[PDB]
Design a protein around this ligand. Structure first.
Ligand SMILES: [Zn+2]
Lengths: 120, 95
RNA sequence: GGAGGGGGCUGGUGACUUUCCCCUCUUUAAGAGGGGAGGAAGUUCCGCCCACCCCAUUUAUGGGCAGCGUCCCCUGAGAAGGGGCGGGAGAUGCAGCAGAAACGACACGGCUCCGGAAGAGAUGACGAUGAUAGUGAAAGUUGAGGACUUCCGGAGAACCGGUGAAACGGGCAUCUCCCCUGCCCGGGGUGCAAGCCGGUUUCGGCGCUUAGCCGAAUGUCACCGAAAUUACAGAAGGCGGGCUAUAGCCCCCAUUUU
RNA sequence: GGUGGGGUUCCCGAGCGGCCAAAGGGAGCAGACUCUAAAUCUGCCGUCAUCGACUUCGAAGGUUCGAAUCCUUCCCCCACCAC
């Protein structure tokens, strides 16, 4: 007999998904403080459950203030790859600026191009 | 999915709710969704447009799931939902 | 007006019995009078009076306490509750995974130089997963008959870390010292079931009480009042601080409400 | 009234803030073994009962990235005291 198929960490991951989806759904209405409360509760349950953030909702939030970042409204997203490949998220509310360095994927593409050169 | 057994640990925010019994007479008859949740308090926005502050331990709640309607005391919902999903065991005896 | 939280108080008089107790008193042995559990007695976290044992007789050195109200942090229906008190140095830890890197800085990749290999002179390599290209190069403006390149290894002035709660740099907690301010000087250890005496195993007396039992006394009823024996709940050497649980009224604060 | 302590699996008992880390022993079940049984060994060991994963460390609150563990409160269990 199997009554409990869903464990504590599974319901924790479901609460992560539901809370951050409701954060996105409520952040577009005009209440950024309610969305900050959702991100704060999701971050508190992430540090409490010792579970990692999903890669979908990972870069959509700010670590300093906690505002859910709408790209374009209160978040400026620019891709610069002259010196090193990076995608920069800029919070318009407080001013915290984060980025996405892509050096090792460029290294993998570079090794694939070296293999295509040496085979040819 | 949200189950009637794990509704003691599922998140209450984002679910329609009505209360059926309470000691406050004017509390009976409200219908709305859950927005904010603290240790023994729900902040419920009515369909009419009024925000109400409902204590949990004085009333019983009927949560509307995907088709389901589950009646749970707020005495079972004691604690912040953070600590409630940590682990909260509540055993109630209405003698 | 209704659940709840905090603060204040918890007895007096009259009658019965020494056969509820203790003390005092006279008197044909029995009576009369007075007093008799509280805010916590519980919890034992502590300190002092009182004792013994050691060092010492010292405010020279040194030891102990405090920085209150205020403020900060955390959780509640935001009234209320709990914790803390200044600054520096040294050491440890922030597991596992991830990340270049987990507590002092660094090795590492983008940047510059050198050596080797491969392609190439109106050709070809590369390039919207960004080209010659600039800025204090976190960041932002730029966006292509743009265009001379790419890799590996070694050495270096400045800038940068897809991760995680927390990062070329500032944090957190613990421990020990020196930098302050004010007060007080015997320092430790055990504790009244300590300690002392008749006795010399075992017992009785002191510590012991404007209540003072120890095989653990403080009884019953009515009433003024409305603070009342109703809830938590009971002394044991005494006093002061803090915690825990609530009966009745008073005061203050909050949600629903109108 | 007083001091020094302990509460973890059915019972006796360990455990650095960290992957059921939960040492374990005895017990139950199953395997193995034996003509049968004892002893030895192996897995479940609380549950699904193959790997593996989740819950319980007396109870609550709080700190923390995270509690058997660190702090506070509520408790109980020991040991010995009249001379
Ligand atoms: Zn911001």
């Amino acid at each position: 007999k199997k009554f409990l198929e869903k464990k504590l960490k599974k319901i924790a991951y479901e609460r992560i998904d539901i809370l951050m989806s409701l954060a996105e759904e409520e952040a577009k209405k005009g209440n950024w403080d309610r969305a900050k409360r959702y991100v704060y509760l999701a971050r508190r349950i992430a540090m409490k459950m010792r579970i990692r953030f999903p890669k979908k909702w990972k870069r959509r939030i700010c670590k300093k203030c906690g505002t859910f970042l709408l790209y374009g409204r209160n978040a400026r997203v620019r891709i610069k790859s002259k010196r090193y490949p990076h995608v920069v998220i800029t919070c318009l509310e407080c001013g915290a600026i984060y980025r996405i360095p892509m050096i090792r994927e460029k290294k993998e593409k570079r090794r694939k191009k070296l293999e295509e050169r040496l085979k040819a | 999915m949200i189950t009637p057994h794990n509704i003691l640990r599922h998140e209450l925010i984002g679910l329609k709710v009505e209360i059926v019994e309470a000691k406050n007479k004017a509390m009976i008859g409200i219908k709305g969704k859950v927005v904010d949740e603290t240790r023994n308090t729900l902040v419920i926005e009515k369909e009419d447009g009024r925000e109400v502050v409902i204590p949990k331990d004085i009333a019983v709640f009927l949560f509307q799931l995907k088709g389901c309607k589950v009646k749970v005391d707020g005495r079972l919902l004691i604690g912040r939902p953070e600590e409630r999903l940590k682990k909260k065991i509540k055993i109630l005896y209405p003698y």
